């Protein structure tokens, strides 16, 4: 997990940080996955991040 807090004026929770950590490796390894997170946790925030 090596996030860049630039352009991230909003606040994201710890599990959101874990989610983006998981998501970054998918792009780094050129792989695609399903983000089947429970609704209401801020998935749009994960996409924006």
């Amino acid at each position: 997990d090596v996030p860049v807090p630039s352009l991230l004026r909003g606040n994201l929770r710890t599990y959101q940080k874990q989610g983006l950590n998981w998501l970054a490796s998918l792009y780094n390894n050129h792989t695609n996955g399903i983000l089947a997170d429970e609704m209401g946790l801020g998935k749009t925030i994960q996409t924006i991040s």
Binding site: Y15, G19, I34, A36, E38, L41
Partner: protein, 49 residues
Amino acid sequence: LLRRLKADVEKQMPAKYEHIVYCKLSKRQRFLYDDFMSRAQTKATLASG
């Protein structure tokens, strides 16, 4: 895959409660129900159709 639940966000989420409500069918509603059941009996209800 990537899946999470509300148990990770628990201890702060207000509890959710489910209630079952029973409503008696109206007199005209009951009559229409029985009439349609009888008509479907004349139609064999198309159960195996």
